[PDB]
Symmetry: C2
Subunit: 214 residues, 2 copies
Amino acid sequence: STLKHLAIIMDGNGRWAKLKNKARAYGHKKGVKTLKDITIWCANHKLECLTLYAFEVDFLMKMLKKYLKDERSTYLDNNIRFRAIGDLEGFSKELRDTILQLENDTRHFKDFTQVLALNYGSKNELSRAFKSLLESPPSNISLLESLENEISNRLDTRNLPEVDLLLRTGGEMRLSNFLLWQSSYAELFFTPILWPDFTPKDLENIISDFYKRV
Amino acid sequence: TLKHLAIIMDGNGRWAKLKNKARAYGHKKGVKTLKDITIWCANHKLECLTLYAMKMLKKYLKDERSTYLDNNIRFRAIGDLEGFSKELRDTILQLENDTRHFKDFTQVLALNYGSKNELSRAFKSLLESPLENEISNRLDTRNLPEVDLLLRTGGEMRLSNFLLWQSSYAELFFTPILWPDFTPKDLENIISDFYKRVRKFGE
């Protein structure tokens, strides 16, 4: 309805494990679970887009690819379109290929899309969109004065609705270079609840307040 | 470490309807707030103060020219100045010129400003006359530091197309206080909080 695109900055995973005198890796696992819970909830409640801010380095890109392979079924199952934003060029060929794969094998699900920000940075994304216009300018570029519409479609999020509600768990109140362009008019919410302790119920209360604001 | 403070002045209209008066009275009051906050930031050694902001503007630039000079306050405007009259543009440019010698504190009024539009003008500039840092220096704010604290008065919680690129890592603050009721005292509590926050992430 009024809330079509929800974006979430998942924070508090490490800090969570710590507070329970546990290993950081243990926190990132519950975090990943909450992620699944949150995307399914959203898919089941008619939301069009859900964007998650996700991100030796050679090993983490391997866990991702194994991760994406693990959940490949859960997407196709619930009919969730997978999409990835960020600088994919910085990933291993093996990973950038699993992603482009999962993306294409889910392109048809046009009702609810789950977007993962991987090796993503708003300034960088906008930089790449610029590099795109310098390499492939639009024919009527000489007759143009405003490039906002040109820029919007060169962004990784091309064809995705603008962010309606941007949420940050973990207590911090910063944007952290996340969807700056796409969140220029998004309703901002913040909560001290660590990501792993974040449940779908919390999401409901927050969404309830969203409408109140509107 | 608090060098650049950006503020979205909002709530001038609700303040007016509340006191049962026309918007003009609220904006009139909001100009005093602006002046007081500005002078307060100069006295406390901030480096830059950016404010998100018709007949009133030319008037303001006219009657306040004196306080910018007395207080050693450098004036600078950002936004799309083209959309302004040939007369309004002169006052603005002239004021930037009559104050360019001040180097300690700078006050930036965002006039006819849009963050998406500013990025659009810098891009166009780059194409025309040729990464992240190159785009940055093409922005209206090119010579100022990144925003450290972005505060929004009025109660609303959204950036509203304001300094999006320049505020990517800024600490966000929201206050229900309406711009005309906002005082230097409110600003101080907020700045004390900003430092408490800066101390908490390192723990």
